[PDB]
Ligand SMILES: OC[C@H]1O[C@H](O[C@H]2[C@H](O)[C@@H](O)[C@@H](O)O[C@@H]2CO)[C@H](O)[C@@H](O)[C@@H]1O
């Protein structure tokens with residue numbers, strides 16, 4: 159499992175994982191950072207599953223073709239090699255790892271299949287696939303076969319199938335892409351028929367896989383196999399006398415292998431992204447690093463110039479490059495896994511007899527066309543999102559303070575706890591993060607299963623089904639309003655509210671929500687949560703003037719719905735009115751809303767007049783007897799002062815102190831009465847001043863001239879001279895501390911952490927360990943600060959083992975930060991109101 163301060167690496171079991179581990183030993187020897195190499199089964203399928211929760215390795219190795227889908231899913235960090243490092247590698251290897259313009263992985267080596275032949279059995283291997291039956295019959299007379307290779311994977315078989323005219327890919331525009339038109343042409347039919355015939359005529363067996371083919375060739379049973387450079391080591395060991403040469407032709411045309419770049423990507427979930435970078439750039443991608451790996455299992459033609467210059471003298475590498483020259487470079491588009499499913503199913507089915515050759519190819523063609531239309535749909539919607547986001551970001555640059563902190567969907571768990579939950583547990587301390595603006599995106603309803611699981615609302619099963627793939631729920635479903643109906647045509651939901659009444663219809667049946675809520679009337683209707691056929695319907699339905707939402711009961715009052723759909727339902731009276739004084743919508747374009755965050759807001763002012771209390775929305779110049787209703791979100795008010803800034807046009811003309819608040823619990827707020835006298839002005843800002851975090855780090859910090867992690871600036875024990883570049887939007891006298899934050903989960907259901915009945919409750923504990931700087935005088939714009947500082951040993955790890963004590967096997971630690979934090983008296987805008 160991933161941990162701060164060490165590296166986990168995944169690579170396939172056919173590559174040089176033991177040599178890679180030797181690189182990792184050198185790293186640890188120079189660096190103190192332990193590196194673990196693993197080769198899980200089906201790693202290319204496991205990765206997107208586990209990385210979607212925030213698990214998986216720090217670094218994943220695979221051929222470049224899968225990485226686009228990973229990147230599109232947010233699973234990969236953009237890598238940041240400088241031009242000097244890029245120049246060390248062959249320039250066009252970088253194109254394999256570039257996706258929508260960005261570099262998403264490091265290229266390591268170019269791979270292609272070759273024909274490998276036993277020179278004692280077959281000094282003159284056939285050029286042609288056509289020669290293979292007659293050759294096999296002849297060798298069968300002395301107990302040998304002509305050719306064995308992996309028939310289970312289309313990486314190996316498709317080159318035959320596409321040989322007779324056919325590119326599997328097309329340059330479509332800007333990019334190599336999957337070819338849909340003419341997948342089942344006469345050339346492909348001829349290739350796959352040829353293969354099926356080799357099987358039916360008993361020159362090959364449909365069950366032959368990678369292990370069977372390898373053991374056969376390496377024990378001298380078969381004169382030929384097809385494989386990549388990685389296979390050469392086990393051949394050398396077996397002492398077979400072998401050559402590597404050009405793939406056979408079919409119908410006079412080359413067998414065009416797939417050309418893959420073995421590539422190293424950094425998991426977005428990694429808190430070790432700088433370490434991963436150092437390992438890959440300065441340890442792996444060096445002559446010594448690649449040599450260690452290559453000496454375990456050969457890499458092929460490596461991306462690193464200096465080392466490839468040695469390798470290209472080997473005739474086996476020359477043969478590999480000759481096949482790669484004739485091959486098809488794989489796209490890295492997201493539809494690549496669906497392509498491979500299609501083409502994998504086709505060969506298996508045709509080879510096993512499950513389908514005729516033409517039915518096999520027809521269904522592949524239909525799958526590939528379906529995948530392409532989905533890609534075209536997505537790209538249209540990703541453009542839509544692109545531009546809404548772009549307006550919202552432009553608006554933020556133009557209209558918010560320069561060093562303002564903004565977020566959007568370790569911290570992921572805490573965002574999720576805010577978004578997926580309701581009431582007291584959802585009051586997360588965003589001010590700790592110096593959060594200023596929260597962006598919400600209405601379309602994240604489609605991502606709500608992950609958000610709900612990560613925020614502890616639902617179980618692993620509800621999130622994405624159990625082992626078999628059963629039990630997933632739909633957490634949120636939007637229902638646009640068309641007259642007196644709310645409809646989701648896709649999901650076949652119709653809600654009719656005509657005739658002052660509600661009828662819910664899903665497909666053909668009438669369904670009875672557990673509850674319906676109406677906003678803004680606040681009417682509610684309790685129902686059974688079932689459909690008329692007797693099946694469960696565990697959903698709540700909320701209707702608003704413009705939209706409806708169907709929500710799974712466990713997220714029926716999620717704060718996301720409050721913020722994105724304007725549904726104020728809460729299990730805590732008061733909660734929603736409070737929330738909206740802490741999140742103020744200051745802009746909205748497309749389906750993006752930007753909220754101004756303040757931990758301290760006023761959601762109601764009452765004024766006493768003629769002796770009766772009445773809520774007011776503005777205030778005139780003069781005297782008022784007032785009662786302010788305050789929301790504290792996620793942290794307490796402590797030793798605060800309350801002011802009114804009288805405002806004219808955009809200028810503070812007076813500061814008027816109206817109250818002191820020594821304490822207010824964030825879960826138990828109470829009204830404050832004040833009597834005030836206001837001068838003339840266009841408007842009045844209510845402003846709270848108390849201690850809190852200020853400043854934004856500009857570059858990574860340095861300890862003793864060394865570049866360090868802003869989230870883990872010092873290990874426990876360590877000390878040093880520290881230097882920080884800090885931005886502030888105004889001047890401050892600040893203290894500086896080291897502050898640790900622990901984010902962890904606690905299992906609250908299920909028998910163990912692997913049970914699909916498990917849900918996990920996130921928690922964040924923040925504490926200030928040491929004051930390392932007093933009265934530092936920060937000035938508007940940029941600043942350099944330098945102090946000596948030590949993090950005592952025991953601080954981290956002491957807490958870590960107290961968590962153990964309290965939670966045992968329920969505990970899962972997700973992040974531990976040690977951060978430098980400035981603290982000063984800071985202003986919080988609680989509410990601005992007009993004069994008149
Ligand atoms: O067969 C489909 C499969 O082909 C490629 O995987 C190769 C891999 O690139 C090679 O490094 C080698 O290990 O053999 C694998 C095939 O068994 C694609 O890279 C992969 O996405 C795809 O599923």
Ligand SMILES: [Ca+2]
Nearest residue numbers: 790791824825
């Ligand atoms: Ca509160």
